[PDB]
Amino acid sequence: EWVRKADRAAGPAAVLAMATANPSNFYLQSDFPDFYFRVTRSDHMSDLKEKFKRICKKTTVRKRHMILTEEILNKNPAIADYWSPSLAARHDLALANIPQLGKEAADKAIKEWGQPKSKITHLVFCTSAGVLMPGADYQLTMLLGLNPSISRLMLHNLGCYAGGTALRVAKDLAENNGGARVLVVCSEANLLLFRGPSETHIDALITQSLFADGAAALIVGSDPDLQTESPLYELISASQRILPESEDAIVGRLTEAGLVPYLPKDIPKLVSTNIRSILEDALAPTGVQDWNSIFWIIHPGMPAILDQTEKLLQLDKEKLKATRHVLSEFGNMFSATVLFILDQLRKGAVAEGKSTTGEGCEWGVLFSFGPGFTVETVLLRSVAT
Amino acid sequence: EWVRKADRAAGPAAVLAMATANPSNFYLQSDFPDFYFRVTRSDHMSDLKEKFKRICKKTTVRKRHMILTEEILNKNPAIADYWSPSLAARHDLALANIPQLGKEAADKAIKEWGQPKSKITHLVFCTSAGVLMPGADYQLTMLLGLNPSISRLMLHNLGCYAGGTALRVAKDLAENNGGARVLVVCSEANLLLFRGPSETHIDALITQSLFADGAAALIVGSDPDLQTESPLYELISASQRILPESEDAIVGRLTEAGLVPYLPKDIPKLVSTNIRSILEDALAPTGVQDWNSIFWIIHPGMPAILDQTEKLLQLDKEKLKATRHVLSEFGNMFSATVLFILDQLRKGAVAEGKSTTGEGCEWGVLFSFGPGFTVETVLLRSVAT
């Protein structure tokens, strides 16, 4: 059967451009335990400091960009405490930083795209760094001078899987509207999660060792004008799933003192149980049986999950190379991390000179996760260089 | 030109079912000034009490359903104060009430729809009553036993226009995925906005006179199986717009003490300036020139906007009848209000026995608004009874 094309697009949604951005201020992981326990007026917790040093080393992270400088933490002491009233201050910082960080990634992705920004018809904006009314989607539209009639989808506090959610949303936006060009932006920061240590809570210390700040921006569109636009990936399928027996695995309570996490269940064992059949379902219409015949993007929120998954699928160590790079160089930047990894993968493919944007392979899987327990899964097709 | 139907849907998204729900506990508007100033330990502000009485009367509201009982306000005194740390308590109440309220509307819309809930493939969930991780979208999926692989879009704290946003999102979900059935749920409550009075702030007293609690649920799908499903409306176009010269018209700061509004600009004059050309743009592909040849749903967040708009377009008073009913009987239920009004309009058409679900008229416009200043506009086509 056939249908009249009408106002709709012919082909699959394509990633047409991608860039990233980070705050200027970063911290090397090897200096962070000293910086963290100094500025949170907490050097006295000497045994906890030792525990944190051990955790920070095992995160295999090297640096993390962070809006929060010593000076800003000085001008907002409540944020540095473990649990003091501080939501308005965190959100004042989100308003001064999150749309601006998004605009820096967006400007670079639009520059690569090479088209006028009045051709952008949709914005998808994800952040867990501050609930704003009007949203960071609004602030970015103003800072960028986008059409006032852009169709915006503002996604607050989905958590870490929202990079997948952004692609899943952009897919239906682009395919159902002919000509539609979708700016996708995930702009993340620890502004809600950052706090001092307490011996009573260690599910808060692990969070201080990993989360960092960054924004990714993409252009997503179908029916590319192949003489002005160069597709980078195709978004072929995009699905969401609640994993069985995962109730309250990841919970985030937003309080007077900001965002407070609670991690009772074994996240690795949950992923390890379920990842294979999820990915088998994603790969089903490709006829790919070899796990190392596809490129890989896994949200790196827990390093152990990468290792255990690498082992289970007996992946070549080179597969998770883009993923492990972003982890080491940037940390967990919430929903943005998987889009950084997509970008590093595209860049490492062109640098090392391989046949496809997907490292020579044809198909690829994007796998992200967070509260639910929720998994987002995207099936990607590379393009030839 | 034509395209292969493939995995996509042939025709426009249709509203196939709708129901509403409210908390059991309600308050008549004529008793509210006494109840409000009593339970907020505030009877001493006698002049403010008089001012509130005047505001409450001019809201033309008759009753409002509210989760917040005297007893619950007794068990959470910080919520009753003007500005005390209370976010965690408000959010504990959101978790116990907002997904459940959504489930009551959903159960009734699914019952009308007449299909098994395993046919539901997408959930769009809007709320400004509490940021939850995982979201009310998750909690509802569990309470309803929906497929764990449903595609969910959780929209926190868009504010009052999100009933339009929900329809705009559901439209592209249904049209781009053949067979897709989209549960749409807006579940709203004043849990973040409720607070005591202060003489220093009157842009907070007006908010206490209008906002109320309620949930609406719809089934949205394209390609209806016309022997098991009876379409109610078609979603023909859906657009969003930032109005010019509207920077900071409506701002909502989420703080330690909950959601605090700020309303510096003249909202009526902004709508009055712009509504005509927006609606003319929506109606453009219909060839309708008569304003009273179409049915009407206007978000009733400010009663004066209804009157001034009724006058400007010289509308027959009968046009905004469904809209004014919901206002009087339920108040401003945030994003849910325009879906209540859609439902009351459908019900008033079948009750008074008219030719179309749109009161005999063929086309209709849905107009909602909130922070930005943002306007959502949906073009609806009725169906014959």
Residue numbers in the entry:
A (entry chain A), B (entry chain A): 7 to 391
What's the publication's text?
In this work, we demonstrated that PECs in agarwood are biosynthesized from a common precursor featuring a C6–C5–C6 skeleton produced by a diarylpentanoid-producing polyketide synthase, hereafter named 2-(2-phenylethyl)chromone precursor synthase (PECPS). The last remaining candidate gene encodes a PKS (PECPS) sharing high amino acid sequence identity with the other four PKSs, as well as the highest 93% similarity with AsCHS1, and this gene maintains the Cys-His-Asn catalytic triad conserved in all known type III PKSs. The crystal structure of PECPS showed typical homodimeric type III PKS folding. Crystal structure analyses suggested that PECPS utilizes unique one-pot catalytic machinery that includes the release of a diketide-CoA intermediate, which has never been reported in other known type III PKSs.
The significant difference between the catalytic cavities of PECPS and CUS is principally attributed to the steric volumes and placements of Asn199, Thr213, and Pro267 in PECPS, which form a constricting loop to cut off auxiliary pocket B from the overhead main catalytic pocket. We also constructed Asn199 mutants in which Asn was substituted with Leu199 and Phe199 to investigate the role of Asn199 in enzyme activity. Interestingly, the activities of N199L and N199F decreased by 35% and 56%, respectively, compared with that of wild type PECPS. ITC analyses indicated that the N199L mutant possessed a binding affinity of a KD value of 120.40 ± 10.78 μM with respect to 4-hydroxyphenylpropionyl-CoA, which was 6.5 times weaker than that of wild type PECPS (18.57 ± 1.37 μM). Remarkably, the crystal structures of N199L and N199F did not indicate critical movement of the architectures around the active site, and further docking calculations for wild type PECPS complexed with 4-hydroxyphenylpropionyl-CoA predicted that the side chain of Asn199 could be essential for ligand binding via hydrogen-bond interactions, suggesting that the relatively reduced activity of the N199L and N199F mutants was due to the hydrophobicity or bulkiness caused by the substitutions of Asn199 to Leu and Phe. These observations suggested that PECPS utilizes only the main catalytic pocket to generate the final products.
